[PDB]
Enzyme design. Sequence first.
Site, short mmCIF file in Angstrom:
data_model
loop_
_atom_site.label_atom_id
_atom_site.label_comp_id
_atom_site.label_asym_id
_atom_site.label_seq_id
_atom_site.Cartn_x
_atom_site.Cartn_y
_atom_site.Cartn_z
N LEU A 34 -22.79 10.00 -25.62
CA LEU A 34 -23.90 11.17 -25.86
C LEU A 34 -23.23 11.69 -24.00
O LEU A 34 -24.01 12.63 -24.79
CB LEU A 34 -24.66 10.27 -25.52
CG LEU A 34 -25.86 9.12 -26.65
CD1 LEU A 34 -27.20 8.91 -26.39
CD2 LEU A 34 -24.94 9.33 -27.94
N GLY A 54 -19.70 13.02 -17.15
CA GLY A 54 -19.92 13.21 -16.02
C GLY A 54 -18.60 12.48 -14.94
O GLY A 54 -18.22 12.23 -15.04
N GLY A 112 -18.89 8.62 -14.78
CA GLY A 112 -19.07 7.64 -16.72
C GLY A 112 -19.46 8.56 -17.38
O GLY A 112 -19.47 9.78 -17.25
N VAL A 116 -21.87 7.93 -20.82
CA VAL A 116 -22.87 6.95 -21.90
C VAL A 116 -22.62 7.30 -23.41
O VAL A 116 -22.80 7.83 -24.35
CB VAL A 116 -24.37 7.54 -21.50
CG1 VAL A 116 -25.22 6.57 -22.02
CG2 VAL A 116 -24.77 7.29 -19.96
N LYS A 173 -23.55 2.49 -20.15
CA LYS A 173 -22.71 3.34 -19.35
C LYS A 173 -22.20 2.57 -18.74
O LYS A 173 -21.96 1.19 -18.86
CB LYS A 173 -23.98 2.96 -18.09
CG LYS A 173 -24.26 4.30 -17.64
CD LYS A 173 -25.32 4.68 -16.33
CE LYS A 173 -25.54 4.06 -15.09
NZ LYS A 173 -26.42 4.34 -14.09
N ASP A 202 -37.41 9.87 -8.64
CA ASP A 202 -36.01 10.31 -9.62
C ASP A 202 -37.48 10.69 -11.52
O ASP A 202 -36.52 10.44 -11.99
CB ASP A 202 -35.10 9.85 -9.70
CG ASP A 202 -33.72 10.99 -10.27
OD1 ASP A 202 -34.43 12.13 -10.20
OD2 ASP A 202 -33.49 10.12 -10.53
C1 LIG Z 1 -27.77 3.27 -20.21
C2 LIG Z 1 -28.25 3.15 -18.48
C3 LIG Z 1 -28.14 3.08 -17.26
C4 LIG Z 1 -29.15 2.93 -16.39
C5 LIG Z 1 -30.26 3.16 -17.67
C6 LIG Z 1 -30.77 3.04 -18.63
CL1 LIG Z 1 -32.48 3.37 -18.09
C7 LIG Z 1 -29.93 3.56 -19.16
N1 LIG Z 1 -30.19 3.91 -20.51
C8 LIG Z 1 -29.98 4.52 -21.46
N2 LIG Z 1 -29.25 5.81 -20.20
C9 LIG Z 1 -29.53 7.26 -20.98
C10 LIG Z 1 -28.51 8.13 -20.08
C11 LIG Z 1 -28.42 9.57 -20.84
C12 LIG Z 1 -28.65 9.82 -21.82
N3 LIG Z 1 -28.38 11.03 -22.48
C13 LIG Z 1 -27.44 11.82 -21.92
C14 LIG Z 1 -27.90 13.35 -21.84
N4 LIG Z 1 -28.63 13.55 -23.16
C15 LIG Z 1 -29.15 12.57 -24.39
C16 LIG Z 1 -28.49 12.20 -25.27
C17 LIG Z 1 -30.06 11.47 -23.41
C18 LIG Z 1 -29.06 8.82 -22.86
C19 LIG Z 1 -29.29 7.56 -22.22
N5 LIG Z 1 -30.23 6.45 -23.22
C20 LIG Z 1 -30.44 6.89 -24.41
N6 LIG Z 1 -31.44 5.42 -25.00
C21 LIG Z 1 -31.17 4.34 -23.63
C22 LIG Z 1 -30.59 5.13 -22.68
#
Ligand SMILES: Cc1cccc(Cl)c1Nc1nc2ccc(N3CCN[C@@H](C)C3)cc2n2cncc12
Length: 271
Positions: free
Chosen positions: A21, A24, A27, A29, A43, A134
Site C-alpha cells: 500500500l 517510505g 519501511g 505498509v 507494517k 498527530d
Molecule cells: C500497520 C500499522 C502500524 C501502526 C499503526 C497502525 Cl494504526 C497501522 N495500521 C494501518 N496503517 C496504515 C498506514 C498507511 C496506509 N495507507 C498508505 C497511504 N495511503 C492509503 C491507501 C493508506 C494504510 C494503513 N492501514 C490501512 N488499514 C490499516 C492500516
Amino acid sequence: KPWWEDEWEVPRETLKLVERLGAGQFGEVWMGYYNGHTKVAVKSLKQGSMSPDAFLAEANLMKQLQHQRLVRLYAVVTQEPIYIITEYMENGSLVDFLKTPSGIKLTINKLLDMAAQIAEGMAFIEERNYIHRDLRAANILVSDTLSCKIADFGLARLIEDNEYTAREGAKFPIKWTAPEAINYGTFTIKSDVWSFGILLTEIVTHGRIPYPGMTNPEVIQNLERGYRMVRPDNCPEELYQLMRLCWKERPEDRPTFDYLRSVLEDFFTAT
Ligand SMILES: Cc1cccc(Cl)c1Nc1nc2ccc(N3CCN[C@@H](C)C3)cc2n2cncc12
C-alpha cells in the site's frame, strides 16, 4: 513480557503479504492475510532506518489502548524484519476516501456522523490519560462500512503529570498543531482538541489543505493577531463555531473530547 510469552507475538509463517500500500524512508505498509483468511495490514520496518525499540514502542502503546474507535493491534513479529500487524481498514485513509467517487457523494449528515466517531475515539484516549499529538484526516482510517477509527500512534504518549514536553529541536506540521505545542513543545489533550478543530476543516472540504493559499508564517502571524481560519466553502455555521471552541486561545478554555462527541452527535440527528 518476553517474546516467547507475549499473547501478541505471532510466528512469521502465519502471514502472507499480498499488496504494497505504501513505502517510505522507514519501511513498507502491506495488505496481507493472517492464517489464509483474515485481512490484516502489515507494517515492516526497514533495517538500519531507525531503532527497533522505537518502532516497537508504538505496538506496546497499542497494547494499552484498545477500543472500537481505535485501530487494533493484531500482533507483532519481534525478529528481523520486525512486523506490526494491525486491523485492516478497507476504505483506507480519510483524507484519501473523501476524494473518491464514493466520498464525493456523501451528504453533510454522514460527514457529521463521521466527525462524531472520531471524537468518540479521542474521548477514550483523553479518559485513559493519553495524548495523540498527530490528529489529522491522514491519520483517521475508514472501514468497509464507512465508519472511522483513530490510527497511527507513533507520537502518542501516557501522561500522569499533566504535560508532555517534547525534544527541543522538534518540529510538527504547523497547520494542525496548537500554538503552545509549536511554541514551547508542551502538549496536552487540549492540543489534540486543537488539531481536531483543523481536522473538521478537512472533513467538510473533502480533504483540501487547511488555511487555503497561506504559507506557514502567514498562518502563525494570523493566529497571533487573533484570527482563525476563514470559513470553509459550504461549512455549516454550527460546525464552524464548533471549530472555534477547538481554536480558543488558552488550553483550559478549549472543550473536552466528550463534549465535542456529544455536540457532533446532536448535529448529526438534527440532519
Ligand atoms: C500497520 C500499522 C502500524 C501502526 C499503526 C497502525 Cl494504526 C497501522 N495500521 C494501518 N496503517 C496504515 C498506514 C498507511 C496506509 N495507507 C498508505 C497511504 N495511503 C492509503 C491507501 C493508506 C494504510 C494503513 N492501514 C490501512 N488499514 C490499516 C492500516
